[PDB]
Amino acid sequence: ELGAGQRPLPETMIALVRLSGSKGNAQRGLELLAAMEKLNYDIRQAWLILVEELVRTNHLEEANKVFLKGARGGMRATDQLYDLMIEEDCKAGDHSNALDISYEMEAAGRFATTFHFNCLLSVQATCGIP
Amino acid sequence: METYEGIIFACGKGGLHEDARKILQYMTAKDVVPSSKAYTGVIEAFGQAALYEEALVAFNTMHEVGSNPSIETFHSLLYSFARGGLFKESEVILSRLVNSGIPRNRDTFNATIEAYKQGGKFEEAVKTYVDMEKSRCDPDERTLEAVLSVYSCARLVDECREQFEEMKASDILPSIMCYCMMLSVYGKTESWDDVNELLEEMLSNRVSNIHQVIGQMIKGNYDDDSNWQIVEYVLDKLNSEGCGLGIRFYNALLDALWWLGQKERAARVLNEATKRGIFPELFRKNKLVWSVDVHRMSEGGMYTALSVWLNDLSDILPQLAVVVSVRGQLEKSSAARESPITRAAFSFLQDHVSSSFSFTGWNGGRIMCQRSQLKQLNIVALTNS
């Protein structure tokens, strides 16, 4: 398509981004997101899709890398995805990533609630330091 | 690296693009970055099958993986473009070769002449041969064959005589391709005296077997069931330098047969080429398109291709019947409809099916016939003189 001089549709890039996440290819998923920004598209929706695919396909470690890069870059995720990332990290004992995300969640403008704190406490209660 | 490059070279030599694509995918699936030579073999295979879109993707992918193209890579494109007459794309390489620090060797000049010739630019073809001698260099045997085809195409009997006799003036024994071009220029001008003079030279040919068999089969001596096995024996022997040499041999042979009136024999010779993989893009027959692609053929070969295609049309419906005479960037311009191939095909179609095939308003190098008009349609007589 690029070699034919045609401009890929925003939906075409999203199909490639979602496919990359299903295979756990975060590097290719991030390369395609950079292309959409170069094509002057809106990468927020495609970034949301990429993170959810990695979480669904048990690539939580890769999902955190992609999520934080977008969140630190200024993009604001959905409240559903915020609750997804915090909870899945705390179920896996990853307090460091769950605390980083919750800090970015409030920086965006979404204040943490009792649900998010209960996720962090689930890991803090097992560290041996009350 | 040694095994991958060895197989891909064979695929590029024989024009097996499907196998070449699988080797490339196999290398990528194993996290192996193919070498710059390996991609050049894949680019070669696509050009053998006239798959320019997939060839330029591989060329684009070479820079992506850091396997920058070598001098041989810019030759695989030039010969691929030369066969199709895509001198617009050939000049892109030439304008790129000077900027890339690569001087113009002899092989670059041969492709330039071949590209201009197939594109109908006769004036610019001889100018390259005129400008080639100024830059010294050393014209090889194919260069003489490259410029002889230019004179033979534009019906220059006296120029072709001087070019041909000088080929044997150095004791070179010109190949069968040059002999078939002599028969075309003599057959185009109806010079039956010179045709018989050259044929007797090919009938003895104590040194070269191919000239004897091909020369004999043109006259019709080998048109028997058992006597067609010897002709096929030569074709199989020539079917070993790949599709690159084969396409040149069959283009000259069909051109000679058509101008000599052996139009039914040209039909069977073309049928021999297709089953060997020559002209893989020649025909498409599906529910959407019935197409014949003649942009890589000579004028005699194109007439044979159209004649068979028209006869097979009347036997049988697709949404469209098309003739692809120009296949490149020239399509999106008014020059493609003025190409010698486009005019020849349209003129040929006009006095064979009346006014049933008209040009396209969206492409310069297409000659279409709608499904509705296909209802209002042997159509072409195939006989030996």
Partner: protein, 40 residues
């Protein structure tokens, strides 16, 4: 908001003889401060 948590602590404890040795290694065995002649 979530507090910027900062957990730092210091403790004093009685020291084992083993920890005393680990500090030094280093045994001072002479009551001399400085040599009279070399001033070393």
């Amino acid at each position: 908001m979530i507090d910027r948590y900062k957990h730092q602590q210091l403790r004093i404890g009685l020291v084992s003889p083993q920890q005393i040795s680990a500090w030094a290694t280093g045994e001072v065995t002479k009551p001399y401060t400085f040599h009279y002649k070399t001033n070393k």
